[PDB]
Design a protein around this ligand. Structure first.
Ligand SMILES: *[C@@H]1O[C@H](CO)[C@@H](O[C@@H]2O[C@H](CO)[C@@H](O[C@@H]3O[C@H](CO[C@H]4O[C@H](CO)[C@@H](O)[C@H](O)[C@@H]4O)[C@@H](O)[C@H](O[C@H]4O[C@H](CO)[C@@H](O)[C@H](O)[C@@H]4O)[C@@H]3O)[C@H](O)[C@H]2NC(C)=O)[C@H](O)[C@H]1NC(C)=O
Ligand SMILES: *[C@@H]1O[C@H](CO)[C@@H](O)[C@H](O)[C@H]1NC(C)=O
Lengths: 107, 385, 120
């Protein structure tokens, strides 16, 4: 199994402040990786696939970066409409796994 | 699919498959045009349009640097070598200008290079049209604080394809492992597949297995020319279909003799494919995959043989090693195991925990009787078709 | 626009079997691959099963194997999930989710979500 560790577990930041979330993979998965956003009590909506692209219908402040077996999501500018929990999932082959999840709060 | 558990040796044979082979490649070049944006500049303080404009202007420079680094003096190396050769052929200025002139009035031109290839070229101009028509008129005396949030959203929605292409090409040293939806859209891929020289049956087969078609291809960056991006992307060609073919999955046949092990492992494992002219043999497991009742192998890694499949070189490729080995031969409709080696082997079920603990001796199974097989706390999955 | 809806089976007693369905509509069934996923409250999502496009791999998570029988049905464009033995720990929300084309295997066009509880 391809375990994933996510850090930090929870964080708080002001509006207009850069926020970073790092996902680490147990073994190399090249560039097959997806991110997700889940508001409380709703279905998750896709944000970034292939660790660098940008799926349609998404504001252009969600940019991701790859570095070997380390991935990172960086929100350019936090907004009041961005309170949710972000996951990261690999899709190397059968099967797929998720992460523990990071909670983002605003001030 | 009819899996025949061979009754006189620990190596089964199968039949009933219809094969499809990768017989070639179909080149396809694009001329994604950004549009003239270097002139436009906003100095009014941070805003919404400013961020997107700076992002596009930085992406152009990043692609230029990536292309400058690119020029160096899932698939076998034949694909990448052919792609590199075609890219080198395309790179030269005379035919670059020829392609640019061909794609000036229409959006479909089946041109030809100096050599003989099909380099059907399609151009996309949504971003260039937007920038030339609406953005320049909307911007007035360098005023980026315009209340048209609709226009800002339109810019964000329009530059997405170019930004994604730049990022994907920069992240993998100029060659992408597979064809993303951004590299070619659905309609463009359908047209390109339908326009290449293959029969209607193969055309329908590809219109069905678009997923496999898009997973087997790849793309290469050509370079930046002024204010445009030019890249090339290839599509695998399935030329010969509907041929009977078979796979041999062999395991050692070891008989315990109170200390001495007498195994029997043939070395002819793989997929044998009798097309028009001869019979081909693919040794590596990665060449062929099972797509329901069919099998997809690539002809670029095939070997030629003439007469075989009697189970009996000519006395058949077979060894008589005395050192046994334990693993699971996951055939599409069964599993064959020769785990003696003082080990534990058993049978699992999709609803019951432990049923029919497996004894040793190159056992026998009729698919549905089990869904997982365990060998000393090891998990093996049976493909349930 | 692909729309996914759920089916109703709220309470299921321990030692019994639960079954729900996700009726896909709008798109066609045999073009791209389909999968399930689940989430117990107060934790993160975990993957359960999937049906690769035409491979019919019907793979499952290694831990929850020998317990599930994910199956598709081309007749009226419906997929069902059936459970073998329900315990007092499988209470969760069950999502049905599609997959997509291309190479990165990104799950989009999820479902509404249905709560399933275990109790006496
Ligand atoms: C919007 O953006 C577009 C491009 O997207 C600009 O169009 C270009 O504008 C530049 C301005 O510098 C033009 O460059 C000029 O080209 C000439 C020299 O290069 C020519 O060489 C031969 C001529 O023998 C031609 O065959 C060849 O095509 C080139 O055009 C000269 O006219 C200019 O240099 C002279 O003036 C400059 C003053 O800036 C001096 O510094 C030089 O020493 C020299 O005296 C100049 O380099 C370019 O040709 C244009 N391209 C096209 C395709 O038209 C628009 O101008 C820009 N709009 C605005 C408002 O900025
Ligand atoms: C661009 O301008 C054209 C011509 O007036 C107009 O029809 C169109 O709606 C505009 N597009 C956007 C996205 O504003």
């Amino acid at each position: 199994d391809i375990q994933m560790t996510q850090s930090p577990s929870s964080l708080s930041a002001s509006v207009g402040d850069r926020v970073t979330i790092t996902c680490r993979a147990s073994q190399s998965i090249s560039t097959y990786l997806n991110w997700y956003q889940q508001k409380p009590g709703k279905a998750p909506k896709l944000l970034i696939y292939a660790a660098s692209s940008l799926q349609s219908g998404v504001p252009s402040r969600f940019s991701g970066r790859l570095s070997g077996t380390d991935f990172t999501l960086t929100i350019s500018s936090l907004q009041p409409e961005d309170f949710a929990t972000y996951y990261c999932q690999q899709t190397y082959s059968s099967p797929r796994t998720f992460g523990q999840g990071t909670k983002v709060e605003i001030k | 699919l009819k899996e025949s558990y061979l009754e006189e040796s620990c190596s089964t044979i199968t039949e009933g498959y219809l094969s499809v082979l990768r017989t070639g490649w179909y080149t396809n070049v694009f001329t994604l045009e950004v549009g003239d944006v270097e002139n436009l500049t906003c100095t009014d303080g941070p805003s919404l349009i400013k961020t997107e404009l700076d992002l596009t202007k930085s992406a152009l420079r990043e692609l230029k640097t990536v292309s400058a680094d690119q020029l160096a003096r899932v698939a076998t190396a034949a694909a990448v070598t052919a792609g590199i050769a075609i890219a080198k052929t395309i790179r030269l200025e005379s035919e670059v200008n020829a392609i640019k002139g061909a794609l000036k009035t229409t959006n479909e031109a089946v041109s030809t290079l100096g050599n003989g290839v099909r380099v059907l070229a399609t151009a996309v101009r949504e971003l260039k049209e937007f920038v030339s028509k609406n953005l320049t008129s909307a911007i007035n005396k360098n005023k980026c604080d315009i209340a048209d949030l609709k226009m800002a959203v339109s810019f964000s929605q329009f530059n997405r394809r170019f930004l994604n292409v730049v990022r994907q090409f920069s992240d993998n040293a100029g060659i992408t492992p597979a064809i993303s939806l951004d590299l070619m859209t659905d309609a463009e891929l359908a047209r390109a597949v339908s326009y290449m020289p293959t029969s209607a049956g193969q055309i329908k087969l590809m219109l069905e297995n678009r997923a496999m078609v898009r997973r087997k291809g790849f793309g290469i960056l050509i370079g930046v020319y002024g204010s445009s991006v030019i890249y090339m992307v290839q599509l695998p060609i399935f030329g010969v279909i509907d041929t009977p073919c078979w796979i041999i999955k062999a395991a050692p046949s070891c008989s315990e003799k109170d200390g001495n092990y007498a195994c029997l492992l043939r070395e002819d494992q793989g997929w044998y494919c009798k097309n028009a002219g001869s019979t081909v043999y693919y040794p590596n497991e990665k060449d062929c995959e099972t797509r329901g009742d069919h099998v997809f192998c690539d002809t670029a890694a095939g070997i030629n043989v003439a007469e075989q499949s009697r189970e009996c070189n000519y006395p058949c490729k077979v060894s008589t090693g005395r050192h046994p080995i334990s693993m699971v031969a996951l055939s599409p409709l069964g599993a064959l195991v020769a785990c003696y080696k003082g080990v534990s082997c058993s049978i699992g079920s999709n609803r019951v925990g432990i049923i029919k603990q497996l004894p040793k001796g190159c056992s026998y199974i009729t698919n549905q009787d089990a869904d997982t097989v365990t060998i000393d706390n090891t998990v093996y999955q049976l493909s349930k078709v | 626009e692909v729309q996914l809806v759920q089916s109703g089976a709220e309470v299921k007693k321990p030692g019994e079997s639960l079954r729900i369905s996700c009726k896909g509509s709008g798109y066609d069934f045999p073009s791209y691959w389909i999968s399930w996923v689940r989430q117990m409250p107060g934790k993160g999502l975990e993957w359960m099963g999937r049906i690769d496009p035409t491979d019919s791999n019907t793979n499952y998570s290694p831990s929850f194997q020998g317990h599930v029988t994910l199956s598709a049905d081309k007749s009226i464009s419906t997929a069902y999930l059936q459970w073998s033995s329900l315990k007092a720990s499988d209470t969760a929300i069950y999502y049905c989710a599609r997959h997509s084309d291309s190479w990165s295997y990104y799950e989009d066009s999820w479902g509404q979500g249905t709560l399933v509880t275990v109790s006496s």
